[PDB]
Design a protein around this ligand. Structure first.
Ligand SMILES: NC(=O)c1ccc[n+]([C@@H]2O[C@H](COP(=O)([O-])OP(=O)(O)OC[C@H]3O[C@@H](n4cnc5c(N)ncnc54)[C@H](O)[C@@H]3O)[C@@H](O)[C@H]2O)c1
Ligand SMILES: NC(=O)c1ccc[n+]([C@@H]2O[C@H](COP(=O)([O-])OP(=O)(O)OC[C@H]3O[C@@H](n4cnc5c(N)ncnc54)[C@H](O)[C@@H]3O)[C@@H](O)[C@H]2O)c1
Ligand SMILES: NC(=O)c1ccc[n+]([C@@H]2O[C@H](COP(=O)([O-])OP(=O)(O)OC[C@H]3O[C@@H](n4cnc5c(N)ncnc54)[C@H](O)[C@@H]3O)[C@@H](O)[C@H]2O)c1
Ligand SMILES: NC(=O)c1ccc[n+]([C@@H]2O[C@H](COP(=O)([O-])OP(=O)(O)OC[C@H]3O[C@@H](n4cnc5c(N)ncnc54)[C@H](O)[C@@H]3O)[C@@H](O)[C@H]2O)c1
Ligand SMILES: Nc1ncnc2c1ncn2[C@@H]1O[C@H](CO)[C@@H](O)[C@H]1O
Lengths: 446, 449, 446, 458
């Protein structure tokens, strides 16, 4: 049961540090919890203090197939039931349309889900539209960058305060700037099982994925050229170590093959696309390559590279999983070995989905920590139980403050082994910042 | 005189951004008829700046800002040209404000001037304090000091402000170029020109991991050093761990109380040189100096001399000078010292900035992008045509703003072409899909580069 | 088997370049060569490139474990039958010597010979020494067999010139610097399989593989420490930006528990051993290490770390296949999770059992190319025409000359795409080097 | 006896010398061991090497250890002003100052040989570059009778010395300390990696990041130079004639190009590939050969490119052709501006001009102070250890029949190199493990004896 929890357990320093620091004066003495987000093995630890919550949970699982079959074997503590369901082999409407939203979510407060998408937002809260001014549970902390703001809340009558836990500082930095940097190091590693020293490769774009994918190749010992459409990112490319060139001739792509430089195209064998555009490598640069090229699409979505033209004119023969031998000028012959063929370094889509199945749980350590801690930036005052005159004074939608991320980062800093200095009272007022923080405004970029 | 132009002409070729403005808008001259009063320090680079400004049809008058910062021989060229300059140091320092007063006031009647290009000056102590009503003709003010914009915003909230102004210190092309890069280029040169030490195999202490901090860390590691990072912000200190550095503090359990028992003597006994990259006071007190390894080097790239302690040293430890970059300070006392003794310290400068005290700093190309945004501000202000708008709208537009992102990218475009690179141009079909026009900025305002 | 040949022939630029270059000259017109090396894939292409120049080549079996059954599919195309063995079939070795040397009941002559193991050379004089005074030379690839060859040369016995293909500047650089820097990354990926940027590791030994091992870890964001007994290697470590530490106080290993610096060993999260020595990591220093530390060995012998002490005095467990959990409680007695335990990676042994894929097939190319030039150089001289008096000078063993190494490296530079400048006559006499001969003396260390 | 512009300049040298000694442990450490013995009493060394502040401590330890030496500069722009005055203030007769002409260079090399108009008797020679060895080997073949030792420093000099032996004109045994590991892989590998980028920036102040450079030659100097340029953000290219060095250049992550198409140089304009040379802003020469940058390549380069040289001699780049065909103008000391429009017709606003560094001489000595102190530690120690070993033999007094075996070039054994390496590592703060008695029976060597065979190249 808990042996699965022991596998990570302390592997998530932030949440465990919160447990070992908030084991005294226990907050969140009110509502129960249900939970709906996907029940991975890692996820079912966000309860933190189960005694301060429902302790039955049952993991309502409002979104699609959130629960997992490991639930029956793992969640077996005292008084906490679980359904242990996966997939849709049976009817899902009986437990989704006729969900425990009314059964477990009884209209006498003492119930939370802390889920993604806010169940049904306006219609959800308007079934029992009396919780306003009586905040004793969930207050729309749903992450869900797709949900973003949902203006319907603002222009509508639903004025319950909400502070979504996405779009923080440590969430994005841990994913793109550092941490999950194994994006390119899943092909350029054993995936091509080749040495990259001395070769020349082309990477298009210089965004966060582009910035993270250009230091690894150079540290390997490769020669890299960067393309960009935005002057700021191109300048950043020039200033670090890289020359900025464009596939198209003279800086203008207008009509045909006469508007591409055929010199640099015929001497590069690896293409990495760190862009989310439509035609960043159309059927015009693949016509000029060094008789052998490997293409991996690291960018978002799958609309990049070619279009439904490369599939027919060039045969996508497969000789190895996630690897192909797309020909260029191998007319007839039935061999395509006279240096006229191209390797597909991926299947044509994101490597994290095709070439990879499992993902580390370290990326969500800073995601769950602030999401749990936001309830105490909430709760606490609970200005809902106040006259409505003061209610409209502070009604707005804000992202999570700076302190709620600095405290999360502090646990990760000392997890590896390290000490952060404490500001003396004299130094705090000289700058204009309290001793406990926060130290920087919202316009700082780090 | 003629020598100054010879110095100028060679350095002129290293600034694609300023020179490209003279021919990108060749013949259009959007800055026709604009009169500008400025007080930026007289340097070779600012000479290129003013020469670029004049080439667009406008005329400017410049003076000194700090008096002490001057090039002497560079003023001969401007004097021969005709624009009055008071870069020469005053014998009794009474010329600090007397010279600035002379440029502003002409004859005995007001004269038409619409723009001001100041550098952190005290014009508010002259213009906004002695004759605020004169602002009926000036349309905008350009400032670059990072602390100036906050003062301007506070004044706007107080309502005493009369004419809107725009700050440029919040631009990406300024913050990224002038802080992260440059210090990476200049830190190694500053260290080696005074010490000539083999940085490989040494151990260094860096206090702070901010804008200058990242460049300082990357500058010492590329030479083959061992670097440790001390930080008070967990978010900034987190970035040190993922950059390969280890986070330590000079105090036991991060608690400081003024007693000698709160200093970690094991860590401080292995460091070779120490730098300070913050803006606070006493980030390295006299207690850290006691535990430092003998024959250490002290550096400062912050703002003032109060970041690392020097008043204690001048009252308790000896001093000795050879060249005005490196000083000898003995860890025994002020009574005396021996020429052969080991108990001494090496201090880079007297605790002030080391980039100015060792070299020219960002020599010619990084400073190019800093000076290009200031000129592009004047064109935008003069295009607004404040005179044509009625007096009713004057109270509506009184606000403090920053350069729009569209004007910022053009400064960066010229820098790329200076390295011989080429920037791709979006097709009309591809631009509309991503949600940005072909020319308009491609990212929102809240993006973190 | 044809597919394996195509990839192997395309991954060996040196031999293929020699085959496509020296064709048309045929420097093996009058050579009678019989060869036997350890049976590998590259041995086939070595035979092919030897016979492409006109040499009369005969192949046999001289090693027992090197033979593989899967090679029979590839030899089926060839008209020459081969023999393979599974294990130590020493009793069958007499059959191989008799049948392969004696073709049709009559003695046979070979102008030059090239074998492996450095043991078959004595057989030539033992069985049929009559024609062994008419052999131009011998080239054998073996370790420590050159010692036996020089011993017999001082003792007389076999009268034939010799030259080895093991000592070369080209062979060292490809493998020691860029061939051994492959297992460490793979080993740590298999073991930890997570980001390790900011932690601390200790690497033992900085002779030749320590440099690659220590350079690979730093670019991943680790603090690397190096311990060494050779002062010159320590000096090279210091100049590269590392730190030199000693597990024992002042470096003196007194054998007691009071002479170990536990302060440093209490902050180390990984132990890497590279040196081929005994008791470089004793059980006393393995008891002062921090919890959850990981030990690994990439050296030569399996008895570098003080192993079997944890086997007897402590307990073991089973984890991910090449991961072992060793508990510091002692013999027996532990709770469900506890905190005192270490982790092994290969119990001090090699990773060839299946832990890592190992070095790629390109390793054998760097050494097999030199053998062709060794044969060609030791064939131009007229052994039958030289008098006995001058044969005293020719009766010597020398390493491969400097000229033959440069021809090997020239092909590698063109493979990646490059051009080598050619000297003018005026400059060549200023250095003292012919425009087509060795460029560096024998005392140049590169 | 001295000749300096001002005696006040010696104060800077000693303060740097004390700092130098504090950061030069091995030379000072071995000084104390032999101070009470004086094993080289009666030695006579005539020295000609770059008089840097690193170099002065060697003269100081030789003179305070019981020997008499005379020293002179090695190049026009070689001697630091403060280092020369410090040695001069100690009483040793030296000839060095600021500003020297080519005709004045030959006056100083022969001044050390002579003594007040009469020849000076000597026993050992410490020569850098082979200039002092050859100048007396032919003009005054008499001094070789008493002189019985020569110690060389650079790679080029040992080639000139070795050529003498084959011709039979060499008469004095020599010690080749340039082959020791603590000099070949320490002095001229890392010294350039620290000094080249300092010398480039101090003259031109260019922002190296994003620019392109070309480096000729990938020997020991080439590796350090390439790393120095690469760590600052440049995009560097390497040209080489030796295939092994080219292989090493490609493996590290550089690119190999040849200024002459297909590598064939024949003097015509069709040999030069103008396209590749049109995107280079910096060219550095490391080979040490003659005429590596010709007229067909120097005038066909991209506008406003920087030329500098680290080789020992000035024949790397053809400065003779451009001297009398193109006008030369000075922008600052040790840096020149050359307009290639015509012989004498140029204006200040011309767009076509090249910038020359150190006039083709050694750039790291002209526009920079040179190698640091801790890099030069591993060379002077071997020099001292070789001088003591050979002086005691007194080859000038050996029997004639024995001279047939004692007239050759020798090298120091590996134990001395190990001792120097240990004494230099101990000053960085490191601890070297000491082998237990059980270790010797497995490694194959004793506790204190050597650790590697002679075929080992590190
Ligand atoms: N690593 C991950 O897990 C992950 C997840 C989602 C998205 N991403 C990617 O991370 C990146 C970071 O975003 P960002 O805002 O820094 O960059 P971006 O989204 O704007 O990516 C494109 C980059 O290339 C440039 N570019 C745009 N269109 C181009 C075109 N047609 N041709 C060439 N260059 C073009 C842009 O200026 C930008 O620098 C995005 O590209 C996004 O797709 C990564
Ligand atoms: N000399 C130069 O070339 C140069 C260039 C730019 C800016 N500056 C000046 O120097 C300073 C550097 O600016 P910046 O961009 O680095 O600022 P920043 O705000 O980006 O960073 C300063 C850092 O100091 C840290 N800090 C403050 N007190 C601390 C303490 N006691 N211990 C540890 N860390 C502490 C903060 O957490 C912050 O991360 C500013 O005053 C700036 O005006 C100098
Ligand atoms: N891929 C591989 O695993 C591989 C490849 C080649 C060789 N090897 C084997 O590796 C072994 C080691 O040789 P190498 O190739 O690594 O190079 P190497 O022989 O140059 O390295 C040995 C180093 O260990 C140091 N050393 C010896 N005893 C020590 C001690 N007690 N404490 C600290 N340092 C000590 C020596 O000073 C030397 O620097 C050889 O026996 C060789 O067979 C392994
Ligand atoms: N601080 C200094 O300035 C300093 C220090 C040490 C050595 N040096 C000088 O450096 C020079 C060589 O140093 P090294 O020991 O590295 O020499 P090296 O012999 O080890 O290598 C020099 C390289 O030049 C190459 N080369 C020669 N002619 C060539 C040609 N025509 N085209 C291309 N490459 C060519 C050779 O292949 C060789 O690899 C010597 O002249 C020596 O005096 C100067
Ligand atoms: N600072 C220095 N002092 C003396 N000789 C040096 C110095 N730096 C380099 N050299 C030597 O100069 C010679 C060629 O310039 C080489 O032998 C090199 O080792």
């Amino acid at each position: 049961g808990r042996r699965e929890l022991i596998i990570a357990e302390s592997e998530m320093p932030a949440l465990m540090g919160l447990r070992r620091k908030y084991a005294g004066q226990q907050p969140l003495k009110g509502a129960k919890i249900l939970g709906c987000i996907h029940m991975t093995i890692q996820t079912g630890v966000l309860i933190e203090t189960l005694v301060a919550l429902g302790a039955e949970v049952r993991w309502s699982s409002c979104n699609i197939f959130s629960t997992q079959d490991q639930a029956a074997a793992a969640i077996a503590a005292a008084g906490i039931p679980v359904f242990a369901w996966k997939g849709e082999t049976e009817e899902e409407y009986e437990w989704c349309i006729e969900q425990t939203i009314l059964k477990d979510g009884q209209p006498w407060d003492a119930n939370m889900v802390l889920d993604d998408g806010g169940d049904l937002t306006e219609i959800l809260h308007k079934k029992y539209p009396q919780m306003l001014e009586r905040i004793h549970g969930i207050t729309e902390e749903t992450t869900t960058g797709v949900h973003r703001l949902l203006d319907m809340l603002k222009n509508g009558t639903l004025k319950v305060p909400a502070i979504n836990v996405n779009d923080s500082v440590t969430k994005s930095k841990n994913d793109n700037k550092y941490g999950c940097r194994h994006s390119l190091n899943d092909a350029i590693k054993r995936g091509t099982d080749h040495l990259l020293s001395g070769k020349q490769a082309l990477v298009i774009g210089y965004g966060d994925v582009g910035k993270g994918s250009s230091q690894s190749l150079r540290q390997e010992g490769m020669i890299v050229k960067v393309a960009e459409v935005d002057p700021i990112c191109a300048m950043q490319a020039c200033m670090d170590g890289f020359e900025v060139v464009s596939p198209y001739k003279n800086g203008i792509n207008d009509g045909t093959e006469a508007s591409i430089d055929a010199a640099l195209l015929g001497k590069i064998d690896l293409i990495v696309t760190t862009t989310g555009n439509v035609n960043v490598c159309d059927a015009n640069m693949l016509k000029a390559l060094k008789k052998r090229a490997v293409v991996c699409n690291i960018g978002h979505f799958d609309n990049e590279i070619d279009t439904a033209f490369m599939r027919k004119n060039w045969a996508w023969e497969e000789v190895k999983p996630q690897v192909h031998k797309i020909h260029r000028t191998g007319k007839d012959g039935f061999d395509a070995h006279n240096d006229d063929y191209l390797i597909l370094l991926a299947e044509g889509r994101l490597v994290n989905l095709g070439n990879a199945t499992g993902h580390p749980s370290r990326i969500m350590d800073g995601s769950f920590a602030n999401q749990v801690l936001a309830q105490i930036h909430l709760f606490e005052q609970k200005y809902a139980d106040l006259p409505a005159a003061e209610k409209a004074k502070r009604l707005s939608v804000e992202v999570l403050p700076k302190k709620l991320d600095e405290e999360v980062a502090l646990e990760m800093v000392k997890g590896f082994g390290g000490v952060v200095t404490q500001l003396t009272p004299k130094q705090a007022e000289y700058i204009g910042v309290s001793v406990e923080g926060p130290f920087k405004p919202d316009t700082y970029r780090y």
